[PDB]
Amino acid sequence: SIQAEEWYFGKITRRESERLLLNAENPRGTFLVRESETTKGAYCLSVSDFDNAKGLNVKHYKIRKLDSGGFYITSRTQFNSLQQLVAYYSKHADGLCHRLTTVCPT
Numbered sequence: 385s386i387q388a389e390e391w392y393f394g395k396i397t398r399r400e401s402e403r404l405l406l407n408a409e410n411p412r413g414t415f416l417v418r419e420s421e422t423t424k425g426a427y428c429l430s431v432s433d434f435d436n437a438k439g440l441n442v443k444h445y446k447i448r449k450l451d452s453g454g455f456y457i458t459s460r461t462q463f464n465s466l467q468q469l470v471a472y473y474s475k476h477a478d479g480l481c482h483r484l485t486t487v488c489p490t
């Protein structure tokens with residue numbers, strides 16, 4: 385269960401995820417997974433980033449889940465679970481702003 389994961393914030397809004405991720409103490413890759421605000425069945429991976437150009441900022445990546453069982457950000461790279469997906473992105477930046485590092489503080 386996703387509801388078991390400490391990085392799963394469930395039904396929080398996009399604005400709220402930005403409020404939590406825009407904390408000065410968050411290093412790049414601080415993240416949380418929440419429900420998509422407008423796509424039934426989808427989730428969103430909200431991630432903190434930082435560069436001199438934009439300072440501290442947030443990126444939101446939609447996560448799709450097929451009834452066929454696969455979870456993914458890009459259909460080319462699928463996982464059997466949301467947990468496996470988070471594990472993979474904690475080791476690979478790929479198309480993300482930074483590899484996932486630590487769960488977002490509230």
Ligand SMILES: CC(=O)N[C@@H](Cc1ccc(C(C(=O)O)C(=O)O)c(C(=O)O)c1)C(=O)N[C@H]1CCCCN(Cc2ccc(-c3ccccc3)cc2)C1=O
Pocket residue numbers: 398419420421422423426428443444445446457458477478479480
């Ligand atoms: C309004 C907004 O924040 N849009 C997000 C997408 C998005 C997320 C959540 C909701 C949203 C919510 O906020 O709840 C909702 O679902 O309703 C909505 C929305 O408003 O509809 C839309 C966006 O454009 N993110 C960027 C994020 C930065 C990269 C650029 N890109 C395209 C992309 C390219 C590559 C990859 C990639 C990643 C890993 C590996 C390989 C490739 C992923 C995305 C994105 O999707």
